[PDB]
Ligand binder design. Sequence first.
Ligand SMILES: O=c1ccn([C@@H]2O[C@H](CO)[C@@H](O)[C@H]2O)c(=O)[nH]1
Ligand SMILES: O=c1ccn([C@@H]2O[C@H](CO)[C@@H](O)[C@H]2O)c(=O)[nH]1
Lengths: 342, 342
Amino acid sequence: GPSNITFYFPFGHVPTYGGDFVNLEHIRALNKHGFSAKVILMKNQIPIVIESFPKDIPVVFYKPGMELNAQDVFVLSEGVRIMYSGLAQTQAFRVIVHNQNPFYTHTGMDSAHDINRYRITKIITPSHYTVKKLEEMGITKPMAVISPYIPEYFKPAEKSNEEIRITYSRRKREEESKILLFYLRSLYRGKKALHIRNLTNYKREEVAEEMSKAHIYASFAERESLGLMALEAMASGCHVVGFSGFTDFENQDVFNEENGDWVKEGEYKKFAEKLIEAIEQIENNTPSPKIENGLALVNSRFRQDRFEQEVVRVYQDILDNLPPLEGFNESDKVVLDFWHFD
Amino acid sequence: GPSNITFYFPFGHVPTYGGDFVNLEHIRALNKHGFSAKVILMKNQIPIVIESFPKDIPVVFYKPGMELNAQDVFVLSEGVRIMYSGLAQTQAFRVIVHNQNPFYTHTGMDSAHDINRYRITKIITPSHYTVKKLEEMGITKPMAVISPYIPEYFKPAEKSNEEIRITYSRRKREEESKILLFYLRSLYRGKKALHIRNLTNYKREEVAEEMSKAHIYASFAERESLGLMALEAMASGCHVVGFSGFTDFENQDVFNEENGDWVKEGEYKKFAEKLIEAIEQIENNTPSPKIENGLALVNSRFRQDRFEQEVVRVYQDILDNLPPLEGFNESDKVVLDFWHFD
Ligand SMILES: O=c1ccn([C@@H]2O[C@H](CO)[C@@H](O)[C@H]2O)c(=O)[nH]1
Ligand SMILES: O=c1ccn([C@@H]2O[C@H](CO)[C@@H](O)[C@H]2O)c(=O)[nH]1
């Protein structure tokens, strides 16, 4: 029969980081396809925060003393340590971890050993690379992959045949972007001025607008799981040049020599050189084939329809393999009073 | 006859960064060996700042309207842009740049072209690597090397045969030190507890004390010119494990496979493994030969006597090759009024 299970995704703030938005996308796909998924808003139950969740995202407020069903599932971030310690206070529920930031695993958990000994049913990740990284850290829990998607509003528009536009972000490696720009100013001896635009405090729709009009995206990616902004750029028809976000580049099989002009750590000269090459490919009308390769990568592997199919497959596979509750029956009510937030 | 030249080293604050202290060491060596060198304190002429210069460092206060001799030399940092723009207001004096931070060249100067066109006589650097880096950026000015020294108070003391002590710094790569420690906690399955000590807000003499008593220095060096803290560790008899500070490691010929257990960017697993190996070399009394190699490197190449000889050689070579003044005679007085500081 039906599972009678709801998946709860904890929040404590306005959705802000990429990971937050991906979680809302899991919720939407789950509810669209016959599951039940909700935000549990742990704290900061105030207008700006409440109103920040679109109306199609069900929200339940945490209040000490509220009840859930013993069979319900919490889908925890790798961050927020207090959710793990809180849920240790009961043998009810199940726990899934959606680890979207493998290098920030330390914020939630002290070691691989603590993860391995916790009652985690499955770790969902954004990429095959993430699975390998968590395994390298010594985590032995079962893992799954659901790759985020790039919204359809990321797509090429008209790019100026007169003015070449380079976009970048200072979200990561801000100091290194200054080093790079010094090398670029120093090595570039072409006659049209460089037009550089910073996409740092923009909303995602506005990022898409800017990328759609830009020729080149200079990548300052760092310790990525997948590399959303480089995929966004590719989806927008930008030539991506710079850091891949993967020191151990061989451990990911998304980015390759044919879809970007990637450099290794500290290769500022080569980065600047490849930017100049990318400008000249435009000026001399000798386009990089990497643009089309990138477009095809995103359109094949990172759009919404496939994402929804993977959400359904992965979460259904979890439901199908839960063991019976121990020490509870189905739809026993369990009091949640494990947190008291300032 | 005598040059009748003084070298002026601008300061605006308490000596703080390594580079500041190296400059005081140039001043001391110059005055010890028959030259004239002084701090010019540009601003912040207040007790805490004035008293922060040891009594053997001559200090002259900048006051708009003061006079210097037309032949005098300014030894500018690669930073502080205002010193370059100020000194552009006169054809008097000469300029040497002591570039101790090649990746921060952008703070003082916009491009290689601006450096190449400025009236810089010579760029003094801390390392052969720095020269190569500045050249790769397209700077064509003549260069020299004066390697800083490690004070004699960095030397081995008694290290506990019972408790193994790992030191590190969070000055650079703070987030990565947390990633590393997660890997170390996760992979280490030896029985004595790890003893980790952070040397971040310590005075240099206190760093030396701690290193003298520590078995291992875990290096979080980043975009170094030379790598002072790794040399300090080596001088103290510590086994150095971790990041070298040089992505383009082949462009420096100080650190090598025989004087440290170096890893490449993102190699947290190997870093943690090498830390465990270093612990076990102590526990099983199978010491790394890298310790002795490091000691010999520092004692041969990075102590004070050689430093003083290089100061004298390099600065004398500059004096010997200055062209006659244009538009001034020797010991004409020039008014300095180019700055007005808040
Ligand atoms: O100004 C910006 C820069 C980045 N991002 C988003 O941040 C995510 C990367 O973590 C991507 O989805 C990217 O569009 C924004 O929304 N706005
Ligand atoms: O607490 C600390 C850490 C580092 N340093 C010094 O910072 C320099 C590296 O830039 C080295 O000389 C090192 O001893 C200190 O003085 N104190």
